[PDB]
Amino acid sequence: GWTDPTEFPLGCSPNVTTPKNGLSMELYSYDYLKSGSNPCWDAAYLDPNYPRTGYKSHRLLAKVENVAGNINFYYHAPMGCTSLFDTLPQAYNYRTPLTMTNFTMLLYGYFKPKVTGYHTFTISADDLLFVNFGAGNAFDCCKRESSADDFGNYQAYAVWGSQTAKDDLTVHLDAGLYYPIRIFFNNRDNDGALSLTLKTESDPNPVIDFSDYFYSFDDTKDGCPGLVSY
Numbered sequence: 001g002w003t004d005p006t007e008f009p010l011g012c013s014p015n016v017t018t019p020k021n022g023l024s025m026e027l028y029s030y031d032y033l034k035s036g037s038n039p040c041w042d043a044a045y046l047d048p049n050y051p052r053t054g055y056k057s058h059r060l061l062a063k064v065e066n067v068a069g070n071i072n073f074y075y076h077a078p079m080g081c082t083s084l085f086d087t088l089p090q091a092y093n094y095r096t097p098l099t100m101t102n103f104t105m106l107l108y109g110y111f112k113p114k115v116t117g118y119h120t121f122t123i124s125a126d127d128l129l130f131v132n133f134g135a136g137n138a139f140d141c142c143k144r145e146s147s148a149d150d151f152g153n154y155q156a157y158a159v160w161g162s163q164t165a166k167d168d169l170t171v172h173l174d175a176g177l178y179y180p181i182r183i184f185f186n187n188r189d190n191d192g193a194l195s196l197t198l199k200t201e202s203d204p205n206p207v208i209d210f211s212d213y214f215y216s217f218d219d220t221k222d223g224c225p226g227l228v229s230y
Ligand SMILES: OC[C@H]1O[C@H](O[C@@H]2[C@@H](O)[C@H](O)O[C@H](CO)[C@@H]2O)[C@H](O)[C@@H](O)[C@H]1O
Pocket: 040, 041, 080, 081, 126, 127, 160, 187, 188, 189, 190, 191, 192
C-alpha cells in the first residue's frame, strides 16, 4: 500500500536552492468541557479522525514556520482540569503564551539524515503523539497540500494512559534524501509532554536537537521523487 508504514520509507529529492530550515507548525484550540465536568477534558482527541479532519473544527491559533531545534518539553500543570497559559520551548518559534494545559499541534515537513543507515526514532507524549514518516505515509514528495489529509497508518504512536504510551520506529534512510514527516500532538488536560529522540550507530548517544535535520520545501506541479534508489 502506498500510504502504509515501512522499514524502507520513500524519500524525496527537491531542488535545494536556499532550502527553508525547520518544519511548519499549526496550533489549534482544545477547549475543556463545561467547568466542573467529570471527565473534565474533551475526549475528541481519541477519535480516529480527530488527527485527520477533526482538529479543523477547533480554533486555528497560529501557522508557524521554521520550527527547528530541540522540540522536547515537559510542561508541569499547576492544577488539573484548569486551562493555564504558558510558553512553548524556543525551537517552536512561537513566543506568545498559549494554553499549554490543553491544545492541539500539527508539525510537518521533511527529515534529512546526516548518515546513511538505520535510524531509530523514539517517542513519548502526554497526551498523544502520532508520527507518519516517508512519502505516501506522511504525504507525497513536493505535493503536500494535495495529499495532506491522506496520511496512512502511523509509524509510531504514543497515548498517555493507553497500552502504548511510548513507541519507536526503525527505518533505513539515505543521507541524500529528504523524508516527509508528520507529527500530531494533543494535550487534553493538565501536564503536557513531547519527547522525540533519534539513535543511530554513528553516535553512542541519542540526538535530541534536530536543527540540522528538519526542512521545508514548496510543492511543485510534478512533485520531487527521490533520485537515489537501491
Ligand atoms: O498525570 C498526567 C495526566 O493527568 C492529567 O490530569 C488528571 C487530572 O484530571 C486529575 O485531576 O488528577 C489526576 C490524578 O491525580 C490527573 O492528574 C490529564 O488528564 C492527563 O492528560 C495527563 O496529563
